[PDB]
Amino acid sequence: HFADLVIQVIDELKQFGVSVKTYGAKGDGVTDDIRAFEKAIESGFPVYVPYGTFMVSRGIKLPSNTVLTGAGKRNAVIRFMDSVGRGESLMY
Amino acid sequence: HFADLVIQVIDELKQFGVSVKTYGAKGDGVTDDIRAFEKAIESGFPVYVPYGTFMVSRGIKLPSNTVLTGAGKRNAVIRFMDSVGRGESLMYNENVTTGNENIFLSSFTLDGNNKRLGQGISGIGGSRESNLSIRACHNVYIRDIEAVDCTLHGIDITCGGLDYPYLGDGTTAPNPSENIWIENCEATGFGDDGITTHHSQYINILNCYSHDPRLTANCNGFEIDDGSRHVVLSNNRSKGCYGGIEIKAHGDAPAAYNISINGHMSVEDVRSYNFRHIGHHAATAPQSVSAKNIVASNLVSIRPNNKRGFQDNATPRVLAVSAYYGVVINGLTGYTDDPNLLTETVVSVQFRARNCSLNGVVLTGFSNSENGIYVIGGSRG
Amino acid sequence: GFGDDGITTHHSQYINILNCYSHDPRLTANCNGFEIDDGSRHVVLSNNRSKGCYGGIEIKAHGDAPAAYNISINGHMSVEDVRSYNFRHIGHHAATAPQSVSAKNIVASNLVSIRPNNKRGFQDNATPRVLAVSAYYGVVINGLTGYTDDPNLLTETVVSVQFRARNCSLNGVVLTGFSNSENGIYVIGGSRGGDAVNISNVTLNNSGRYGVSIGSGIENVSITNISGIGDGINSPVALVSTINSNPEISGLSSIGYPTVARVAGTDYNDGLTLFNGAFRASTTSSGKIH
Ligand SMILES: [Ca+2]
Ligand SMILES: [Ca+2]
Ligand SMILES: [Mg+2]
Ligand SMILES: [Mg+2]
C-alpha cells in the first residue's frame, strides 16, 4: 500500500508523459495488457513503454496525434498472445 | 533509511530496465563502479546508465544479448581510472575468441583515459586498448557514442582474437564480425584510427565524426583495413587526420574489398581518400589478389595539408589510388584557399592500379601544384 | 521472419526509408527485403540493407495495378539476395500485352550487390541477378558494384535490361567474380526486348563469357569505356558482343578475352570506335548531312 503512493507521485510527474503501466500494464510476458494501452492512447497524452514483454489479445489501434515511444528495441517488447485470431495487424 | 525504500520502488518499476546505480554505481568521478556494471549485465536485463562519470578499474566485458543504453554523450560518461594497467579495451565483448551476439550500445561517452599514461603512447599490440572493441560478433548496433582520449582506436570492429591475424594475401580470417551498424558516433584523440574495421563484413558506418588524433603515424579518421569487406560508409566526417578515409591492407594481409562510400566530408586531412595495398606496389612485388571494388560518391576534400607531419611528411592528396582494381568515383570536389598546402599532385592513380573511373570532378584553388589529376606511368604505374 | 515483405509501400507518396534492415523472410514467394509496390510514388530509399530475400529492393506493380514511379535510391547494400535490384511491371512484359503507362523514373546510386544466389529457391528457383530492369522507362544507375566469391551461384546473366524496358543508363559499374555466368551485362533483344540504353565506364573483373551483350532488333545503345579481365573465366568469348551493327561503341579494352568486340558477326580484336548516323568532324559549319 506504501509503494502505490510513491508510484502515483511518479505517474503525475510524467517524466516521459503517461506510462502504460499507470493504466495497468504488467509487461510480464503473460498478462494481457491490451486495455492499458487503449486507455493510455485515448487519454491524449504521449504514451511511454518501459521494459517488459507487453502481451496483447487484439491489434493496437492508433488515433490521430499519438506519440508512442518505448525504451528501445529488445527492451520494450509488444507481442501477440498465443491465442489471437486472424485478420488484425499487431499495430495499426 | 527512508530514501532507500523510495529508490527500491523505482528500481522495481524498471522504467528503462535495471539502472546501474541499482547495483551500487556512484558515478561521482572517483568511485570504482566496475562491479556494479558486471552485476547489471549478467542479470539478463537491459542496463541503463544515468548521469555521472562512472569510473572503472578494468575493461567492461559484454556477453551475448546485451542492451546498454545511457543518458547521452557528455552525460553518461564511462572512464578508466588513473591507475589501470595495460592490455584492455575500455569496453569490449566477453567471448574474445568466438565472439558474441545481439549487442546494442546507445548514448554515452567513453573516455579511455590515455592521459594517465603520459604523452604519445598507443596500444601495446593487436586490437588491445581501444575505447570500444567488437571481436567476432554478430548483429551489433552502436549509436550515439562519443569516444575521447583513446589509447588505440575509438571504435574497432575485428575478428576473433586479441592480435590481428596475418595469414597472407588471398586469405579470409576465421570468426569474422558480421552485421555491424555504427551511427552518430564520435572519435577523437586516438592513438591509431578513429573508427576502423578488420577481417569483418556487412557494416554500415553512418553520420559519424572522427577527428584530431594524438599521434603522427598511420592516424586515419576512418580506416577500412586488413580483411574488411562489404562496408558502406555514408555521410561521415573526418578532420585533422592523415587519411580521411583509408581503404587498405598490410603486406601479409588481404586488402579490403567491395567497399562503398555514399558521401563523405574530409576536412584538413593529408590524404583525404587514400586507397592502397602495402607490399603490392613495387614492380617486382606480387600482384594483389584482394584489392578490388570501390564505389564512391559525393566526396568532399577540404584544404588537404600536412602541417602536423604525418607519415614522414607525406605529400597531401585529395585522392590517391594504388594497387586497387575497379574504383568508381562519381562527384568529387576538392577545395582550398591556401595554395601552399598541396604542391605535388592533387589527384593520383598509381602503384599498379587498374580500372578507375573519375567522373564529375571539381578541383579548385590548387594554383601551386604541378598536377591536378595525374595517372603516373613508369615501371609500376 | 516475415510472410511477404520486410518493409513495403502501396498507393502512397512522399516517403523516406532510411538506414533500415530487412532480412531472412519465412517463406519462398515474392519475399522482398524492400518492396515499393502498386501505386507507390515519390519514395527515397537511402543506406538500407537487405539479406537472404528474393529481391533486395523491388520496385514493381501487379497487372491490374499502376507501377511505382519516381523512386530514388541513394545507396543500398544487398546481401545474398536472389535479384538484388529488381524492377518490373507484371502484365506489361509480353509483346502482345498493353504498354505500361505508369512504370517511369528510377534513379539509383551506390548500389551494392553481394553474392546474389537462389539457394532457398524463391519464385520457382528464379535465376539470380545483381540487377534486372523490365517495363520501366527512365532508369538511371550511377555506381554499381556486384561482388561474388562463389561463381556457381549465378550462371545466367549478372545484369539484364528486358521486357519492353526503355531509356536506361548504367554508369560506373564494377562486376567481379562472376566467372561462370554467360553474360555480364545483357540487353535482351527479340520480340519484347530492351532498347535505348547507355552502358558507360564499366569494369568487368572475370565476369561473363560475353561481357556486354546486345540482342537482335535493338535500334539504340551506347557503349563507352568498358574494360574487362577474363583470365579466370571458364571459356570467355567476347568483351563486347552485338548481334546487329547499330549500337555505338568507344573506349574498349580487355585482357584475357579472345575477342574485344564482336559486332554483326565480325571480330574487331583490338576494339572498335563506331558511330552511326550523320557525321561531322573538324569543320566550322555545314549544311545537310545524310
Ligand atoms: Ca592506422
Ligand atoms: Ca511480395
Ligand atoms: Mg589497422
Ligand atoms: Mg505488395
XYZ file of C-alpha atoms in Angstrom, chain B:
381
model
C 16.742 4.958 5.502
C 13.562 6.473 4.007
C 15.034 7.303 0.579
C 16.233 3.682 0.242
C 12.628 2.428 0.172
C 11.628 5.030 -2.437
C 14.678 4.036 -4.516
C 13.849 0.307 -4.288
C 10.304 1.029 -5.500
C 11.703 2.783 -8.597
C 14.326 0.034 -9.072
C 11.441 -2.442 -9.431
C 9.431 -0.161 -11.740
C 12.228 -0.543 -14.318
C 11.399 2.488 -16.491
C 14.496 1.875 -18.636
C 15.050 -1.597 -17.209
C 17.610 -2.083 -14.444
C 19.678 1.014 -13.671
C 23.391 0.546 -13.000
C 23.072 2.558 -9.754
C 20.699 -0.169 -8.501
C 23.734 -2.473 -8.351
C 25.826 0.088 -6.457
C 27.187 2.532 -9.028
C 28.090 6.035 -7.845
C 29.157 7.915 -10.991
C 30.882 10.590 -8.907
C 34.163 10.659 -10.845
C 36.077 8.905 -8.056
C 34.362 5.638 -7.044
C 35.246 2.407 -8.860
C 31.888 1.216 -10.222
C 33.173 -1.845 -12.142
C 31.376 -4.484 -10.021
C 28.037 -2.665 -10.384
C 28.321 -2.925 -14.177
C 29.292 -6.631 -14.282
C 26.345 -7.469 -12.000
C 23.833 -5.441 -14.028
C 24.863 -7.025 -17.353
C 24.796 -10.647 -16.105
C 21.293 -10.095 -14.660
C 19.824 -10.544 -18.157
C 18.212 -7.101 -18.066
C 18.727 -4.025 -20.295
C 21.244 -1.913 -18.373
C 20.640 1.839 -18.168
C 23.291 4.452 -17.385
C 22.115 7.748 -15.823
C 24.126 10.972 -15.387
C 27.660 10.782 -13.962
C 31.330 9.959 -14.514
C 31.328 6.192 -13.978
C 34.948 5.289 -13.191
C 36.366 1.820 -13.904
C 39.489 -0.179 -12.936
C 39.252 -2.882 -15.645
C 37.604 -3.353 -19.073
C 33.835 -3.863 -19.268
C 33.017 -7.257 -20.798
C 29.833 -7.650 -22.857
C 28.135 -11.068 -23.184
C 25.540 -12.065 -25.801
C 22.119 -10.350 -25.903
C 23.025 -7.149 -24.032
C 21.243 -3.795 -24.230
C 23.313 -0.943 -22.811
C 21.771 2.499 -23.267
C 22.833 5.643 -21.398
C 21.559 9.197 -20.915
C 23.610 10.655 -23.790
C 27.029 11.880 -24.873
C 28.758 14.029 -22.206
C 26.021 12.984 -19.771
C 26.513 9.296 -19.054
C 30.320 9.042 -19.054
C 32.420 5.883 -18.639
C 36.085 6.350 -17.739
C 39.234 4.364 -16.944
C 40.810 5.201 -13.576
C 44.249 6.859 -13.340
C 45.787 3.556 -12.163
C 44.536 0.997 -14.712
C 47.190 -1.304 -16.231
C 47.824 -2.243 -19.863
C 46.141 -4.703 -22.239
C 42.425 -3.948 -22.029
C 39.867 -2.067 -24.089
C 37.534 0.200 -22.068
C 34.531 -1.653 -23.471
C 34.572 -4.943 -25.397
C 32.737 -8.239 -25.906
C 33.273 -11.096 -23.415
C 33.999 -14.069 -25.702
C 37.172 -12.741 -27.358
C 37.791 -15.932 -29.380
C 34.368 -16.901 -30.792
C 32.522 -13.596 -30.230
C 29.027 -12.720 -29.033
C 25.587 -11.795 -30.424
C 22.917 -9.060 -30.354
C 24.689 -6.166 -28.605
C 23.104 -2.684 -28.530
C 25.120 0.313 -27.306
C 23.467 3.736 -27.185
C 24.080 7.281 -25.917
C 27.223 7.501 -23.749
C 30.754 8.914 -23.621
C 33.737 6.585 -23.342
C 36.871 8.295 -22.002
C 39.757 5.853 -22.470
C 41.915 7.975 -20.140
C 45.130 7.597 -22.136
C 46.078 10.867 -20.403
C 47.077 8.718 -17.386
C 49.955 7.066 -19.301
C 51.735 10.242 -20.474
C 52.482 11.851 -23.840
C 52.500 9.919 -27.118
C 51.600 6.342 -26.177
C 49.485 3.859 -28.163
C 48.214 0.252 -27.885
C 50.725 -2.411 -26.800
C 49.794 -4.853 -29.587
C 46.800 -6.143 -31.534
C 43.246 -4.852 -31.071
C 44.030 -4.134 -27.401
C 43.332 -0.795 -25.675
C 40.566 0.791 -27.770
C 37.607 2.651 -26.248
C 35.434 0.011 -27.923
C 36.392 -3.365 -29.424
C 33.938 -5.691 -31.164
C 35.531 -9.058 -31.941
C 33.944 -11.967 -33.866
C 30.472 -10.579 -33.076
C 27.184 -10.845 -34.959
C 24.449 -8.177 -35.089
C 25.949 -5.211 -33.214
C 24.206 -1.821 -33.201
C 26.279 1.121 -31.944
C 24.555 4.501 -31.670
C 25.319 7.977 -30.323
C 28.654 7.031 -28.679
C 31.451 9.539 -28.050
C 34.990 8.143 -27.818
C 37.503 10.614 -26.358
C 41.186 10.218 -25.371
C 41.805 6.754 -26.834
C 44.912 4.589 -26.456
C 44.404 2.630 -29.688
C 41.154 3.126 -31.621
C 37.928 4.916 -30.757
C 35.797 2.125 -32.215
C 37.307 -1.039 -33.698
C 35.466 -3.895 -35.389
C 37.563 -7.031 -35.881
C 37.628 -10.835 -35.942
C 38.312 -13.292 -33.086
C 41.490 -12.917 -31.046
C 43.353 -10.042 -29.413
C 46.029 -9.891 -32.117
C 45.245 -9.055 -35.744
C 45.787 -12.149 -37.929
C 48.319 -12.136 -40.783
C 47.537 -15.200 -42.901
C 48.999 -13.645 -46.076
C 47.149 -12.266 -49.106
C 44.104 -14.012 -50.630
C 43.056 -15.423 -47.257
C 39.869 -14.927 -45.248
C 40.334 -14.876 -41.447
C 38.243 -17.154 -39.160
C 35.498 -15.841 -36.824
C 34.645 -12.535 -38.544
C 32.373 -9.811 -37.212
C 29.096 -9.630 -39.126
C 26.124 -7.229 -39.359
C 27.519 -4.116 -37.657
C 25.850 -0.693 -37.521
C 27.687 2.431 -36.340
C 25.674 5.664 -36.338
C 26.049 9.195 -34.890
C 29.326 8.288 -33.154
C 32.357 10.489 -32.457
C 36.037 9.551 -32.190
C 38.877 11.874 -31.111
C 42.363 11.994 -29.511
C 43.070 8.407 -30.552
C 46.354 6.513 -30.904
C 45.809 4.791 -34.228
C 42.451 5.187 -36.002
C 39.161 6.861 -35.044
C 36.751 4.277 -36.453
C 38.108 1.088 -38.041
C 37.211 -2.378 -39.359
C 39.279 -5.569 -39.746
C 38.537 -9.042 -41.166
C 34.783 -8.372 -40.907
C 31.810 -7.976 -43.253
C 28.424 -6.233 -43.592
C 28.993 -2.897 -41.896
C 27.211 0.448 -42.099
C 29.166 3.411 -40.757
C 26.793 6.377 -40.904
C 26.838 10.067 -39.837
C 29.945 9.664 -37.675
C 32.783 12.084 -36.927
C 36.403 11.039 -36.427
C 38.979 13.770 -35.816
C 42.225 15.091 -34.288
C 44.378 12.021 -33.473
C 47.024 12.171 -30.721
C 49.857 10.822 -32.850
C 51.584 11.122 -36.246
C 51.793 7.590 -37.696
C 49.026 5.999 -39.798
C 46.396 8.033 -37.957
C 43.308 7.830 -40.113
C 39.845 9.248 -39.398
C 38.233 6.166 -40.887
C 40.295 3.110 -41.781
C 38.796 0.113 -43.538
C 41.772 -2.200 -43.018
C 43.000 -5.814 -43.384
C 40.415 -8.399 -44.440
C 37.461 -5.989 -44.422
C 34.672 -6.372 -46.991
C 31.122 -5.231 -47.806
C 31.244 -1.932 -45.899
C 29.101 1.137 -46.574
C 30.296 4.495 -45.284
C 27.746 7.286 -45.642
C 27.760 10.961 -44.662
C 30.614 10.769 -42.151
C 33.219 13.451 -41.492
C 36.945 13.425 -40.780
C 39.238 16.261 -39.655
C 42.950 16.796 -38.902
C 43.905 13.167 -39.615
C 46.320 11.614 -42.098
C 43.786 9.743 -44.238
C 40.181 10.955 -44.151
C 39.099 7.523 -45.330
C 41.701 4.825 -45.892
C 40.819 1.550 -47.582
C 43.958 -0.571 -47.433
C 45.779 -3.642 -46.120
C 49.255 -4.655 -44.947
C 51.686 -6.844 -46.938
C 50.720 -10.084 -45.182
C 47.041 -9.115 -45.174
C 44.233 -9.391 -47.752
C 43.037 -5.956 -48.924
C 39.639 -4.518 -48.048
C 37.326 -5.234 -50.980
C 33.825 -4.242 -52.118
C 33.725 -1.005 -50.107
C 31.146 1.729 -50.740
C 31.220 5.424 -49.871
C 27.888 7.232 -50.178
C 29.151 10.749 -49.482
C 31.920 11.930 -47.156
C 33.374 15.214 -45.913
C 37.145 15.276 -45.407
C 38.436 18.392 -43.622
C 42.142 19.353 -43.429
C 43.379 15.748 -43.770
C 46.639 14.806 -45.507
C 45.313 12.228 -47.967
C 41.527 12.749 -47.858
C 40.834 9.486 -49.697
C 43.705 7.033 -49.701
C 43.366 3.550 -51.172
C 46.313 1.156 -51.424
C 47.696 -2.307 -50.663
C 51.103 -2.085 -48.950
C 53.541 -4.688 -50.309
C 51.826 -4.840 -53.701
C 53.009 -1.517 -55.175
C 56.546 -2.215 -56.458
C 57.179 -3.665 -59.929
C 58.876 -6.884 -58.707
C 56.285 -7.317 -55.924
C 53.482 -9.902 -56.359
C 50.122 -8.606 -57.612
C 47.299 -8.151 -55.105
C 44.600 -10.818 -55.390
C 42.269 -8.987 -52.997
C 42.329 -5.219 -53.739
C 39.040 -4.925 -55.669
C 35.840 -2.843 -55.940
C 35.457 0.665 -54.541
C 32.421 2.846 -55.342
C 32.451 6.429 -54.056
C 30.055 9.378 -54.476
C 29.818 12.995 -53.248
C 33.388 13.066 -51.966
C 34.436 16.365 -50.407
C 38.093 17.174 -49.704
C 38.740 20.493 -47.936
C 42.167 22.130 -47.500
C 44.290 18.950 -47.719
C 47.588 19.538 -45.917
C 50.363 18.003 -43.822
C 51.178 20.690 -41.246
C 51.284 18.103 -38.434
C 53.767 15.983 -40.419
C 52.025 12.599 -40.654
C 53.824 9.625 -42.249
C 57.271 11.306 -42.502
C 55.655 14.434 -44.005
C 53.879 12.541 -46.816
C 52.681 14.871 -49.598
C 48.982 15.871 -49.448
C 46.283 14.410 -51.729
C 42.592 14.906 -52.375
C 42.607 11.332 -53.669
C 45.247 8.648 -54.102
C 44.514 5.226 -55.597
C 47.063 2.389 -55.540
C 47.034 -1.374 -56.299
C 43.223 -1.471 -56.469
C 41.150 -2.822 -59.352
C 37.713 -1.366 -60.130
C 37.431 2.068 -58.499
C 34.360 4.211 -59.309
C 34.235 7.890 -58.290
C 31.145 9.990 -59.042
C 31.171 13.620 -57.991
C 34.332 14.738 -56.245
C 35.044 18.248 -55.015
C 38.451 19.368 -53.784
C 38.677 22.906 -52.407
C 41.481 25.002 -50.915
C 42.053 28.687 -50.129
C 45.759 28.141 -49.402
C 47.780 27.025 -52.487
C 50.920 26.202 -50.459
C 49.472 23.231 -48.541
C 49.475 20.976 -51.616
C 52.218 21.379 -54.226
C 52.873 17.960 -55.783
C 49.713 16.262 -57.110
C 46.042 16.881 -56.259
C 44.718 13.532 -57.542
C 46.818 10.484 -58.466
C 46.293 6.925 -59.734
C 49.400 4.791 -59.257
C 51.272 1.703 -57.991
C 49.784 -0.991 -60.282
C 46.214 0.422 -60.014
C 43.741 -0.573 -62.739
C 40.162 0.116 -63.919
C 39.451 3.516 -62.398
C 36.623 5.909 -63.261
C 36.800 9.560 -62.252
C 33.508 11.218 -63.146
C 32.257 14.723 -62.271
C 35.291 16.288 -60.603
C 35.759 19.876 -59.424
C 39.230 20.810 -58.194
C 39.756 24.460 -57.232
C 42.368 26.649 -55.553
C 45.328 24.320 -56.142
C 47.114 27.027 -58.142
C 50.568 25.976 -56.942
C 50.507 22.226 -57.559
C 52.269 20.600 -60.513
C 49.378 18.299 -61.481
C 45.634 18.411 -60.981
C 44.936 14.813 -61.971
C 47.923 12.567 -62.616
C 47.913 8.976 -63.822
C 51.520 8.005 -63.116
C 53.228 5.818 -65.712
C 56.622 4.154 -65.455
C 57.508 0.670 -64.258
C 54.619 0.200 -61.794
C 52.136 2.901 -62.901
